[PDB]
């Protein structure tokens with residue numbers, strides 16, 4: 126049949142072929158000898174120019190003016206800018222197109238049905254840590270919108286030759302502190318012990334709770350990072366309660382409303398935006414299963430199982446499974462009660478299947494990372510578990526980058 | 531070169547050096563990962579001879595007599611047979627070592643900690659479908675052992691040039707019939723409609739129940755398959771009930787005790803055994819989650835949810851998750867009550883992590899398919915979810931093969 130990967134849905138028996146992978150210009154980690162699909166982690170005017178031309182071609186194709194006079198003029202304008210300056214700059218409309226395409230192209234994101242609705246904030250005129258903080262606060266206010274969350278990304282100046290990078294040191298705009306204890310344990314979020322100590326080293330006076338919002342460490346080019354505390358009024362949080370287990374509220378658990386990844390690099394046409402925080406809204410399992418139940422995170426499974434009086438002495442009682450379902454239900458219930466946007470894993474995966482169908486028609490495929498798209502609880506109860514997926518790298522893209530310290 | 535493998539829950543790292551022994555290519559390439567696909571899209575004497583030498587070498591190393599006199603002689607015998615006849619035959623001890631190694635090498639099996647304990651039945655002297663049936667009956671009795679299941683494999687004659695294969699048409703030795711009804715609905719197991727129809731077409735008088743055990747369609751070389759009904763007393767079944775929901779037993783559900791894949795090909799030293807049924811014992815999620823809850827299988831989720839009087843109006847009530855957990859609990863409870871061997875997914879995954887460590891020390895790694903090792907429910911609540919894995923093909927191996935019709 127067709128000389129492209131054949132992809133099957135085992136629940137429905139349907140088949141599609143992915144032709145979009147032909148547009149990939151970057152290799153992944155796999156080879157015919159071994160699959161590394163489950164691993165978490167993966168300028169010369171010569172390569173920059175090829176990447177820029179490819180992106181300009183993508184942009185002109187998107188506005189249906191491929192091969193037009195304007196297309197050819199833009200291409201020559203980029204070559205001349207690179208020729209004399211070693212780099213180039215994107216037009217406003219090109220940046221918007223690029224950021225939306227990077228989201229659309231993200232294999233690990235199950236929320237891509239929303240890709241065309243992204244609000245892109247242009248902050249390429251930023252020149253200091255203080256101004257970065259103002260842009261970030263504005264992003265947070267706009268995105269949170271008192272609970273009716275709106276997808277958004279704020280783009281700071283791109284990396285420049287011979288000049289330091291703009292960087293947000295925090296992994297997310299909102300994260301809880303993790304305090305290493307005398308006995309070696311951690312009060313708060315164990316995932317954030319390093320960033321927490323860095324904040325302390327930079328003058329932050331730490332709290333002592335389990336849910337203390339961390340300050341931001343913002344770095345303008347060639348300067349030590351500066352510390353900024355987020356005004357509490359801007360950080361929306363949701364106290365957690367359960368619809369039928371009245372004692373759940375007594376555990377004093379809570380989570381923040383805005384998921385805002387802030388340490389990824391946005392690559393568009395060879396240009397690199399080292400600081401471009403983006404945010405959408407939470408899928409409930411992110412909080413209920415991973416943040417609260419991972420053994421290396423808050424690890425609350427046993428505490429909740431004990432309150433439910435389950436037999437935590439043996440695996441066959443499925444106490445972990447029962448407690449996790451209740452915790453996830455509490456997260457959903459609590460956000461709904463607080464009128465804060467959130468999506469359950471069944472609804473998110475159903476919407477992602479719709480996205481796959483949309484993209485099959487629009488582009489001939491959709492890069493997706495099965496291990497990340499299938500939720501952490503109830504995997505086979507969702508439609509995505511039964512859908513084969515092809516994973517490849519397309520640009521524009523969001524990519525991991527080394528920590529700045 | 532060697533892939534770095536990390537466990538994100540513990541922070542530990544290992545390097546897989548075993549993948550270097552892989553001689554057969556998988557589906558991925560640097561351009562795209564197809565790790566989530568279920569199925570892949572006389573032989574030259576020289577190739578066969580190299581596969582045979584490698585295998586004989588593996589065997590003599592296993593009994594610590596590498597380079598010995600017996601080793602050299604055996605190598606000479608295989609060479610002589612292939613040179614004169616184009617093929618060769620394994621000695622029984624080699625067949626036993628080879629079957630255990632194929633299990634040990636199976637990337638999709640989470641039960642490999644048991645690999646060294648396997649009863650191997652040599653059925654290579656079988657010359658008719660009737661004889662196949664006797665060996666299959668003895669396999670089932672031995673493996674079932676009145677509920678104290680014992681791992682076993684029965685090996686029928688290898689494939690030979692220009693001659694039809696010995697084949698078992700059924701996908702497993704014990705499976706429930708699936709009957710197409712007028713309205714296109716199915717009574718029984720939808721996954722088995724095709725084989726059920728073949729059995730009828732070959733003279734089976736069908737039942738009309740939801741749990742009717744299918745007869746076996748056995749095929750000797752170049753002859754039509756013959757039908758054999760399994761003596762009811764040999765097929766141990768477990769009636770499903772719930773420890774606290776009295777009405778569950780009323781659903782009239784049941785499952786068989788013995789999982790016994792019968793359509794895979796066993797490859798050892800270049801030789802291929804097209805009929806080599808194997809069996810261990812079930813991991814509870816196979817029955818509770820996939821067989822009973824898959825939408826395209828018995829699909830009982832909604833019925834159970836309604837019996838539990840859950841709110842099936844919206845996905846946000848997590849009714850699917852709550853029902854799934856209770857069904858899995860019923861399976862565990864029922865098998866333990868019937869005194870039939872079964873392992874829950876927590877215990878199985880914990881044992882698989884021990885197996886990974888044992889193999890890292892023994893061979894420098896372990897091929898594993900992450901999407902298949904992580905259980906269909908409660909994925910992140912198990913240790914394997916947080917463990918990076920490397921997938922590759924080692925030989926001896928179990929492989930898929932085309933359906934015989």
Ligand code: HEM
Nearest residue numbers: 228231233234235236239276277403404405406407408523
């Ligand atoms: C609108 C709602 C959205 C939802 C529900 C959603 C949901 C998700 C989920 C569940 C993941 C996996 C996160 C994890 O397990 O760590 C993910 C990853 C990701 N999302 Fe989305 N997403 C949304 C919006 C966005 C937006 C606005 C962007 C970018 C403009 C985006 C870009 C990404 C990227 C790049 C990743 C991978 C991050 C990583 O590798 O850690 N998502 N998303």
Ligand code: HEM
Nearest residue numbers: 633636638639640641644681682808809810811812813928
């Ligand atoms: C001792 C009990 C064992 C347990 C608990 C166990 C468990 C499993 C599970 C849960 C799977 C995935 C099945 C699926 O989702 O379809 C599997 C696959 C597999 N197991 Fe094991 N297994 C056991 C014994 C065996 C034995 C004795 C052999 C062979 C000698 C074996 C060979 C395989 C192979 C080749 C696969 C992949 C089958 C496929 O691709 O459909 N297993 N096993």
Ligand SMILES: N=C(NCCC[C@H](N)C(=O)N[C@H]1CN[C@H](C(N)=O)C1)N[N+](=O)[O-]
Nearest residue numbers: 236384385386403404405406407408411
């Ligand atoms: N819904 C999300 N999710 C992504 C951010 C939240 C996610 N649950 C998280 O905490 N991400 C961290 C932990 N794991 C990622 C990694 N690669 O290590 C980063 N984003 N969005 O824009 O709407």
Ligand SMILES: N=C(NCCC[C@H](N)C(=O)N[C@H]1CN[C@H](C(N)=O)C1)N[N+](=O)[O-]
Nearest residue numbers: 789790791808809810811812813816817
């Ligand atoms: N526990 C197992 N499990 C494997 C066989 C049972 C499994 N639940 C099953 O029904 N397998 C079918 C459906 N999926 C596989 C495939 N590749 O299509 C075959 N094996 N064993 O020997 O102990």
Ligand SMILES: C[C@H](O)[C@H](O)[C@H]1CNc2nc(N)[nH]c(=O)c2N1
Nearest residue numbers: 163164165496497915916917918
């Ligand atoms: C080792 C394994 O790749 C790792 O635990 C992955 C699996 N799937 C995931 N899926 C999502 N969405 N998020 C994660 O952090 C992970 N972690």
Ligand SMILES: C[C@H](O)[C@H](O)[C@H]1CNc2nc(N)[nH]c(=O)c2N1
Nearest residue numbers: 510511512513566567568901902
């Ligand atoms: C499409 C996807 O590969 C498919 O549904 C896989 C996922 N993981 C699985 N894992 C196991 N153990 N068994 C299966 O049948 C599957 N099916």
Ligand SMILES: [Zn+2]
Nearest residue numbers: 155160558563
């Ligand atoms: Zn791969």
